[PDB]
């Protein structure tokens, strides 16, 4: 009968109201959250009417279209967002693709800096407005975030305050957990980004294959029946929730960690301990638990995916079963490969199958086929081993540096704010990969670049720039990283225009926080990039030196800016011959 009313009894009023709260924020970036909230209370007062009498007015419409309807009623929808209320002039569905076309990637709103005594004043008077602001925040930031992670989230922002605000070093206590919360989230919303865009690019069957390979690789016990299943379910969950369908996406998940943990015996050992929990912190649990241990009875291989005889009949018949099959076995045994490598196996084996199968004697042709396998592997791994070298002898931020120098080179026409971004991004993932047991490192690496190039290509949809990037961010979803290391300088390229102002620095960034004056610098270093593309790493490295002495002597004068006044353009200049 009413949907509005089963989503509702389903969720309770708490989890429905914050769900509802975060999947407008994230349709209606730009409004103030005190009208958000005021849309969320009519549209959660209409479902209590409908709880009580479903055959009532409108209670039998569609989620979408009630709230749809709600979101199409707000004050200054047109002078607020020009191309949303063309949307609201169509139905179901159209109305719901374009407000999902329009969500908006890069917002560029202020940076949520923790301002301990002015938060802990809120939340003591108001805990209930206090996370309802918390969740829309992050939503508006990030419309594509998981809605019911975001709901754990603030759990977790909800303990922060509760432990630290009666503290005696209360910004002491409070700064490094919601720097740490910040952290978590970032990487929460990059992941399940790239689930989006994985559907939007690549299609269902892209995402049921990433899953397959990544569950295989959790859950390793688990048989091919379980796995399928697990990922026929939770395809369906991130389908709705990336389609803004919130409340049943939350719904779904509830009954697949149910299912999960009704079943854990023959899943995974290491679901245990999230299975004894309350319900948003079991189905975080699960989503983020490590491998299990590799079973001593896992098959050989060979058997049936080289030797059997009717391969050619089996890969005929049902395709995507059989290769299906394949996909989980090879990547139960292998956690110690990327997700992205197990795809590339799964195609390569897919395209020998075909090449061998078209052929006088298949057999014979496919007998080699695991050998083929190696180089798919080899490179990675070396590039993984170079990098952390790298990573270990310099450190994050010249990591970082020579990442940023590495991607403006593959693509100067990014706007500089963004090839920092990634470049300072990609810094942070050898922070996290380089230091692990060395067999992680790979999985780890490779994994983590696939979230930040997904960044980078999802903000060149909203600004093309460069048609290798929008090659490497289309062909392929399994090929992507490896598209992106082939890339070399754009030699097409013209040189950006000078414009000594760039380079140009004053006794402002003395005042800025380590992490902000790096930015300026790696700013710097970006358009030092273009340009002369044609400088090396090392004259780049030198150059950049030479800028930074500079700042920290200017910073550490008497005098701030005449020393920036009279030493700076000298080397602006000095630093032109420097490179190329
Ligand atoms: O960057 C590349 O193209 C090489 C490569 C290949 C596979 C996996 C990772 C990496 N690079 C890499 C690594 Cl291994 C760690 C931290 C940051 C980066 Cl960019
Ligand atoms: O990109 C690399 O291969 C690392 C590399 C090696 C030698 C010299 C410089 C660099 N990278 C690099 C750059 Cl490009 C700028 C500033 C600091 C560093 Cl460590």
Same mark, same amino acid.
């Given at each position: 009968?009413?949907?509005?009313?089963?989503?509702?009894?389903?969720?309770?009023?708490?989890?429905?109201?914050?769900?509802?709260?975060?999947?407008?924020?994230?349709?209606?970036?730009?409004?103030?959250?005190?009208?958000?909230?005021?849309?969320?209370?009519?549209?959660?007062?209409?479902?209590?009417?409908?709880?009580?009498?479903?055959?009532?007015?409108?209670?039998?419409?569609?989620?979408?279209?009630?709230?749809?309807?709600?979101?199409?009623?707000?004050?200054?929808?047109?002078?607020?967002?020009?191309?949303?209320?063309?949307?609201?002039?169509?139905?179901?569905?159209?109305?719901?693709?374009?407000?999902?076309?329009?969500?908006?990637?890069?917002?560029?709103?202020?940076?949520?800096?923790?301002? +301990?005594?002015?938060?802990?004043?809120?939340?003591?008077?108001?805990?209930?407005?206090?996370?309802?602001?918390?969740?829309?925040?992050?939503?508006?930031?990030?419309?594509?975030?998981?809605?019911?992670?975001?709901?754990?989230?603030?759990?977790? /922002?909800?303990?922060?305050?509760?432990?630290?605000? +009666?503290?005696?070093?209360?910004?002491?206590?409070?700064?490094?957990?919601?720097?740490?919360?910040?952290?978590?989230?970032?990487?929460?919303?990059?992941?399940?980004?790239?689930?989006?865009?994985?559907?939007?690019?690549?299609?269902?069957?892209?995402?049921?294959?990433?899953?397959?390979?990544?569950?295989?690789?959790?859950?390793?016990?688990?048989?091919?029946?379980?796995?399928?299943?697990?990922?026929?379910?939770?395809?369906?969950?991130?389908?709705?929730?990336?389609?803004?369908?919130?409340?049943?996406?939350?719904?779904?998940?509830?009954?697949?960690?149910?299912?999960?943990?009704?079943?854990?015996?023959?899943?995974?050992?290491?679901?245990?301990?999230?299975?004894?929990?309350?319900?948003?912190?079991?189905?975080?649990?699960?989503?983020?638990?490590?491998?299990?241990?590799?079973?001593?009875?896992?098959?050989?291989?060979?058997?049936?995916?080289?030797?059997?005889?009717?391969?050619?009949?089996?890969?005929?018949?049902?395709?995507?079963?059989?290769?299906?099959?394949?996909?989980?076995?090879?990547?139960?045994?292998? +956690?110690?490969?990327?997700?992205?490598?197990?795809?590339?196996?799964?195609?390569?084996?897919?395209?020998?199958?075909?090449?061998?199968?078209?052929?006088?004697?298949?057999?014979?042709?496919?007998?080699?086929?695991?050998?083929?396998?190696?180089?798919?592997?080899?490179?990675?791994?070396?590039?993984?081993?170079?990098?952390?070298?790298?990573?270990?002898?310099?450190?994050? /931020?010249?990591?970082?540096?020579?990442?940023?120098?590495?991607?403006?080179?593959?693509? +100067?026409?990014?706007?500089?704010?963004?090839?920092?971004?990634?470049?300072?991004?990609?810094?942070?993932?050898?922070?996290?990969?380089?230091?692990?047991?060395?067999?992680?490192?790979?999985?780890?690496?490779?994994?983590?670049?696939?979230?930040?190039?997904?960044?980078?290509?999802?903000?060149?949809?909203?600004?093309?720039?460069?048609?290798?990037?929008?090659?490497?961010?289309?062909?392929?979803?399994?090929?992507?990283?490896?598209?992106?290391?082939?890339?070399?300088?754009?030699?097409?390229?013209?040189?950006?225009?000078?414009?000594?102002?760039?380079?140009?620095?004053?006794?402002?960034?003395?005042?800025?926080?380590?992490?902000?004056?790096?930015?300026?610098?790696?700013?710097?270093?970006?358009?030092?990039?273009?340009?002369?593309?044609?400088?090396?790493?090392?004259?780049?490295?030198?150059?950049?030196?030479?800028?930074?002495?500079?700042?920290?002597?200017?910073?550490?004068?008497?005098?701030?800016?005449?020393?920036?006044?009279?030493?700076?353009?000298?080397?602006?200049?000095?630093?032109?011959?420097?490179?190329?």
């Amino acid at each position: 009968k009413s949907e509005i009313a089963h989503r509702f009894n389903d969720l309770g009023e708490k989890h429905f109201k914050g769900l509802v709260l975060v999947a407008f924020s994230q349709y209606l970036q730009q409004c103030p959250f005190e009208d958000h909230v005021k849309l969320v209370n009519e549209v959660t007062e209409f479902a209590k009417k409908c709880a009580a009498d479903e055959s009532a007015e409108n209670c039998d419409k569609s989620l979408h279209t009630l709230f749809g309807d709600k979101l199409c009623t707000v004050a200054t929808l047109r002078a607020t967002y020009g191309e949303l209320a063309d949307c609201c002039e169509k139905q179901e569905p159209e109305r719901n693709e374009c407000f999902l076309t329009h969500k908006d990637d890069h917002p560029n709103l202020p940076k949520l800096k923790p301002e +301990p005594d002015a938060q802990c004043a809120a939340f003591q008077e108001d805990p209930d407005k206090f996370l309802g602001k918390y969740l829309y925040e992050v939503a508006r930031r990030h419309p594509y975030f998981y809605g019911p992670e975001l709901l754990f989230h603030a759990e977790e /922002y909800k303990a922060d305050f509760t432990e630290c605000c +009666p503290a005696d070093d209360k910004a002491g206590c409070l700064i490094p957990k919601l720097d740490a919360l910040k952290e978590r989230i970032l990487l929460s919303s990059a992941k399940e980004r790239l689930k989006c865009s994985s559907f939007q690019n690549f299609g269902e069957r892209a995402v049921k294959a990433w899953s397959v390979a990544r569950l295989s690789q959790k859950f390793p016990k688990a048989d091919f029946a379980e796995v399928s299943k697990i990922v026929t379910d939770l395809t369906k969950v991130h389908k709705e929730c990336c389609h803004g369908d919130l409340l049943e996406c939350a719904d779904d998940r509830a009954d697949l960690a149910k299912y999960i943990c009704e079943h854990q015996d023959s899943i995974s050992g290491k679901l245990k301990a999230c299975c004894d929990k309350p319900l948003l912190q079991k189905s975080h649990c699960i989503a983020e638990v490590k491998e299990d241990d590799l079973p001593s009875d896992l098959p050989a291989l060979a058997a049936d995916f080289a030797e059997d005889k009717e391969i050619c009949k089996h890969y005929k018949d049902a395709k995507d079963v059989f290769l299906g099959t394949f996909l989980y076995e090879y990547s139960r045994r292998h +956690p110690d490969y990327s997700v992205s490598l197990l795809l590339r196996i799964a195609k390569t084996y897919e395209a020998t199958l075909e090449k061998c199968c078209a052929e006088a004697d298949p057999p014979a042709c496919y007998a080699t086929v695991f050998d083929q396998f190696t180089p798919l592997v080899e490179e990675p791994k070396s590039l993984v081993k170079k990098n952390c070298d790298l990573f270990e002898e310099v450190g994050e /931020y010249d990591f970082q540096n020579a990442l940023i120098v590495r991607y403006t080179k593959k693509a +100067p026409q990014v706007s500089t704010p963004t090839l920092v971004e990634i470049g300072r991004t990609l810094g942070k993932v050898g922070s996290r990969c380089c230091k692990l047991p060395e067999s992680e490192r790979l999985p780890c690496s490779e994994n983590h670049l696939a979230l930040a190039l997904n960044r980078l290509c999802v903000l060149h949809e909203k600004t093309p720039v460069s048609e290798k990037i929008t090659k490497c961010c289309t062909d392929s979803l399994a090929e992507r990283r490896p598209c992106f290391s082939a890339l070399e300088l754009d030699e097409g390229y013209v040189p950006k225009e000078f414009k000594a102002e760039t380079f140009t620095f004053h006794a402002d960034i003395c005042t800025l926080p380590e992490d902000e004056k790096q930015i300026k610098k790696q700013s710097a270093l970006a358009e030092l990039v273009k340009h002369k593309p044609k400088a090396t790493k090392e004259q780049l490295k030198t150059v950049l030196g030479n800028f930074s002495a500079f700042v920290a002597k200017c910073c550490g004068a008497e005098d701030k800016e005449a020393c920036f006044a009279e030493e700076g353009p000298k080397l602006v200049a000095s630093s032109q011959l420097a490179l190329a």
